[PDB]
Write a protein that binds this DNA or RNA. Structure first.
Length: 375
RNA sequence: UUUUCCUUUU
């Protein structure tokens, strides 16, 4: 960082690998524009960006929601003669899945094979995840068979990903065979394995069992993470045990686990659904003061709670404040307000919010169309 | 030096 500038002012000409690490750090901080600037500066200095340089920027653009730009960057390396490698393909395949473009991801999966690149464990893990999320467990499980055929050994992320896919599909007991199957293979379960299973137990109404697995996990030596506690906080809220959810929130602190924005969003959502708007809004104040910045989910959640209560002025006030503070509204924000307005019979307010959403380039969905008190 | 798993909002 500054230490880099100091190094540079001693006349030391740093390796590309040094530049890459830096561009990587910037990307993962949210400082993407600074990353692209340093990209442009290495080029101006005659320092050639390599395949890792490109792979790093393609990922950060994808993670920033800029799949088009990452796509242009991919075209640019190919034009330069800088060959996309297995990581380039894995990275774009992941971005395409996360973006709803499974079909194009699977086209890249065929393209890499045509260039003599072998799909590897990450290639398979990413498509198995992308298929499971798309409702396609069966194809995911066929991809799981196929990797064993190519000689590629299912690892801990492969088992975790599949167990997540099975739990979301109702295949809870099946996930649990897989869990014993990975131990039988010498793959050690992580916190992620337990958290996944704990979530599936909660969603299936087995909070009893989910807490028993939480106890066993701590017993097997596995220290809970913030996700462990978020998942159990959510399940207690969804169950109607908000008091116990607040106890767990106290507890995680006692045990050294730092709450974060999802911890707040979750408690705020369960207080909202309970009708305890009072406490939700206070908890919202608490997170700012403690330095945890509310994200879009935080506003959406509070806006939802206020709309359902018929407190439209208060809900619009949080929308205004969110739009003020640089927090960008999404499809869920506008669906929530239109929903709220339609419910109240304020149909032209809602139609005028529909137009404004398009005005910001946010893509509507059936939800947006479906919602009409017209009928 | 870069890519893949789990929790929250309509």
């Amino acid at each position: 960082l500054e230490l880099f500038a100091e190094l540079r002012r001693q006349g030391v000409a740093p390796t590309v690998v040094t530049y890459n690490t830096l561009i990587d750090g910037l990307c993962k901080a949210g400082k993407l524009d600074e990353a692209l600037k340093l990209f442009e500066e290495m080029v101006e200095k005659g320092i050639k960006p390599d395949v890792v340089t490109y792979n790093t920027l393609i990922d950060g653009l994808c993670k920033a929601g800029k799949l088009d730009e990452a796509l242009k960057l991919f075209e640019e390396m190919v034009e330069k003669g800088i060959k996309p490698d297995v990581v380039t393909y894995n990275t774009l395949i992941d971005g395409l899945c996360k973006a709803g473009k499974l079909d194009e991801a699977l086209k890249l999966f065929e393209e890499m094979v045509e260039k003599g690149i072998k799909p590897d464990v990450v290639t398979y893990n990413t498509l198995i995840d992308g298929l499971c999320k798309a409702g396609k467990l069966d194809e995911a499980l066929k991809l799981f068979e196929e990797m064993v055929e190519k000689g590629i050994k299912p690892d801990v992320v492969t088992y975790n990903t599949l167990i997540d896919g099975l739990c979301k599909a109702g295949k809870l007991d099946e996930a649990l065979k897989l869990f014993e199957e990975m131990v039988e293979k010498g793959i050690k379960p992580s916190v992620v394995t337990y958290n996944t299973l704990i979530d599936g137990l909660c969603k299936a109404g087995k909070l009893d069992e989910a807490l028993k697995l939480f106890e066993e996990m701590v017993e097997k030596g596995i220290k809970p993470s913030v996700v462990t506690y978020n998942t159990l906080i959510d399940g207690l809220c969804k169950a109607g045990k908000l008091d116990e959810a607040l106890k767990l929130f106290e507890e995680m602190v006692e045990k050294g686990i730092k709450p974060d924005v999802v911890t707040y969003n979750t408690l705020i959502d369960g207080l909202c659904k309970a009708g305890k708007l009072d406490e939700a809004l206070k908890l919202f104040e608490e997170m700012v003061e403690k330095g945890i910045k509310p994200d879009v989910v935080t506003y959406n959640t509070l806006i939802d709670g206020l709309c359902k209560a018929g407190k439209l002025d208060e809900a619009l006030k949080l929308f205004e404040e969110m739009v003020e503070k640089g927090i960008k509204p999404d499809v869920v924000t506008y669906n929530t307000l239109i929903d709220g307005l339609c419910k109240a019979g304020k149909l032209d307010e809602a139609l005028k919010l529909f137009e404004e959403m398009v005005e910001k380039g946010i893509k509507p969905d059936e939800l947006t169309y479906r919602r009409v008190v017209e009928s």
